Amino acid sequence: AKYRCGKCWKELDDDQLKTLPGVRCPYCGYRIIYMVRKPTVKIVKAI
Amino acid sequence: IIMNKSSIERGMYRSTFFRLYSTEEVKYPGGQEDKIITPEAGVKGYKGK
Amino acid sequence: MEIKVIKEEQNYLELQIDGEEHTIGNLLKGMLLKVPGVKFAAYSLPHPLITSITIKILTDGSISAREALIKAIELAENYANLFIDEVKKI
Amino acid sequence: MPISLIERNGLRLRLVLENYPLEFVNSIRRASILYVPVMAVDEVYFIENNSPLYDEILAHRLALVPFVSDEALEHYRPPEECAENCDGCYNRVYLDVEAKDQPLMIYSRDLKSEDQMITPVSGAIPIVLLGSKQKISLEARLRLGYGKEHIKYSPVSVSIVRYYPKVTVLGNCEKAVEVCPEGVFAMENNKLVVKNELSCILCEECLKYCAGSVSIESVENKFILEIESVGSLKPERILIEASKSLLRKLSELKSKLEAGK
Amino acid sequence: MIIPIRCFTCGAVVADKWEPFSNRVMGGEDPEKVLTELGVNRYCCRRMLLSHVNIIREIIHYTRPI
Numbered sequence: 001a002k003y004r005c006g007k008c009w010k011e012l013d014d015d016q017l018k019t020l021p022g023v024r025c026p027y028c029g030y031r032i033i034y035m036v037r038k039p040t041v042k043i044v045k046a047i
Numbered sequence: 048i049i050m051n052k053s054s055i056e057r058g059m060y061r062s063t064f065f066r067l068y069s070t071e072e073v074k075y076p077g078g079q080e081d082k083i084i085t086p087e088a089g090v091k092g093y094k095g096k
Numbered sequence: 097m098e099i100k101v102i103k104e105e106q107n108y109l110e111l112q113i114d115g116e117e118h119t120i121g122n123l124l125k126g127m128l129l130k131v132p133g134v135k136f137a138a139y140s141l142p143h144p145l146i147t148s149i150t151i152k153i154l155t156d157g158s159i160s161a162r163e164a165l166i167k168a169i170e171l172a173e174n175y176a177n178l179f180i181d182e183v184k185k186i
Numbered sequence: 187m188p189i190s191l192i193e194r195n196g197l198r199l200r201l202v203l204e205n206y207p208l209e210f211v212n213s214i215r216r217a218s219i220l221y222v223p224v225m226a227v228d229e230v231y232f233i234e235n236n237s238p239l240y241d242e243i244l245a246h247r248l249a250l251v252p253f254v255s256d257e258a259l260e261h262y263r264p265p266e267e268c269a270e271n272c273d274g275c276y277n278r279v280y281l282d283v284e285a286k287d288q289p290l291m292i293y294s295r296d297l298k299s300e301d302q303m304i305t306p307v308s309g310a311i312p313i314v315l316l317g318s319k320q321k322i323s324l325e326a327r328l329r330l331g332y333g334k335e336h337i338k339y340s341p342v343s344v345s346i347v348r349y350y351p352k353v354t355v356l357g358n359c360e361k362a363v364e365v366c367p368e369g370v371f372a373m374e375n376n377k378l379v380v381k382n383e384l385s386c387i388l389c390e391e392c393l394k395y396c397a398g399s400v401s402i403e404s405v406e407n408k409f410i411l412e413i414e415s416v417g418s419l420k421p422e423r424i425l426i427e428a429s430k431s432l433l434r435k436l437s438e439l440k441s442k443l444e445a446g447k
Numbered sequence: 448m449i450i451p452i453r454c455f456t457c458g459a460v461v462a463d464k465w466e467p468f469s470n471r472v473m474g475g476e477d478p479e480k481v482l483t484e485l486g487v488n489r490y491c492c493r494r495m496l497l498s499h500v501n502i503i504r505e506i507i508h509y510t511r512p513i
């Protein structure tokens with residue numbers, strides 16, 4: 001899916017298409033990336 | 048002890064519990080085969096669709 | 097809110113009401129204790145986790161227990177109407 | 187069986203009931219909490235959330251916010267009716283905020299309501315603090331409900347029924363002025379006059395020291411009923427709706443009791 | 448983490464009285480007078496206001512990178 005660079009918390013977004021020899025942010029060269037919230041309406045009951 | 052239910056419904060002693068799961072792709076240098084993290088369309092130990 | 101009858105005689109009634117709690121039970125007991133001819137009136141909550149009450153009425157035979165319950169309901173309705181009409185004036 | 191008024195503050199209302207039984211007054215007090223409908227958030231539709239608060243916590247905070255459900259009691263279906271489908275009984279509010287470079291606090295004035303006569307009671311309620319480059323986008327649905335189902339539907343904060351006091355001064359003991367926690371007594375020309383008798387809570391502490399100069403009784407047929415609303419409804423409307431709920435329940439019970447005798 | 452919307456014991460709204468009380472107390476005013484004149488009289492709401500910690504101002508720095 002889509003990822004987000006871990007440096008400075010919410011840095012920038014990248015996708016599957018960035019094929020690199022290792023897990024690395026193409027922009028800042030950071031080795032930790034996270035996953036996006038999969039934009040979709042989520043229903044939660046205010047109980 | 049007896050606790051007030053109305054104060055509980057206002058969020059008095061509510062809490063959240065966090066658990067962690069972890070995995071690694073072992074390289075298996077002994078035979079050069081490697082792991083991979085993909086879905087399991089057709090595999091031996093399949094669980095269910 | 098559903099009612100059922102556990103026991104019933106001319107001078108005895110045991111009524112189980114599901115969907116009710118102290119708000120109506122205490123009012124009905126207080127009104128029943130004022131109706132003439134009623135010798136014993138009580139309500140019980142069998143379990144706090146269950147919303148249901150049991151009303152026990154025992155008269156002296158002059159008036160049927162069901163009639164006593166109807167009279168108590170009439171008294172409560174009269175009091176409620178009077179309260180509305182008096183609060184609306186202030 | 188008259189009803190007298192003691193005080194009318196912004197949200198408080200105190201009355202004296204003179205010929206009502208204690209059971210009826212207590213029933214009115216309980217129904218002012220349990221069986222009066224107000225508007226509150228029922229469900230939240232989340233699109234984005236980056237705030238420190240999770241979705242469930244944010245939904246709970248939104249639900250606890252009181253809305254002005256005064257004109258909505260005549261245009262929206264009550265929970266006792268069908269109310270779960272047939273749109274026309276749900277109000278919709280939106281919240282779309284974002285912080286650019288500095289932390290930003292989100293207040294209840296940022297909630298935009300589809301229907302203009304249903305607004306938050308107060309616009310200065312802090313909801314969530316957002317850090318840099320954090321945003322929230324959600325839609326919430328409002329509906330009527332009773333306090334019996336959930337406490338977020340209760341229209342009052344305190345509902346009180348207490349006895350009617352009667353304090354009489356027999357002697358001239360000076361201790362009573364410095365013992366009563368309610369400040370009922372006062373010293374005027376060294377006589378121990380009673381200023382505000384209705385403030386006594388039948389504490390019976392002046393009897394421990396005076397014991398002969400002060401007599402305390404409770405009037406057998408008068409009661410004091412004090413309620414304080416939260417802002418959604420005015421107290422008189424709350425009392426009227428509580429008594430109407432009692433009327434409906436009694437009518438239903440009698441109707442289904444006399445039938446099938 | 449953040450001030451509760453309502454008092455736990457009674458359903459009185461107390462969240463809107465935090466940013467005044469938190470400021471005027473830091474200005475040298477004694478808490479009792481500020482609480483009394485803000486409209487807080489039952490000691491449950493006084494307990495709610497007097498013992499808040501407000502951690503969220505530190506947690507906004509450490510937020511989930513989702």
Ligand code: F3S
Pocket residue numbers: 362365366367368369370385386387388389390391392393402
């Ligand atoms: S001293 Fe004071 S508050 Fe009540 S019963 Fe006796 S009056």
Ligand SMILES: [Zn+2]
Pocket residue numbers: 005006007011012025026027028029030
């Ligand atoms: Zn990066």
Ligand SMILES: [Zn+2]
Pocket residue numbers: 454455456457458459489490491492493
């Ligand atoms: Zn309180």
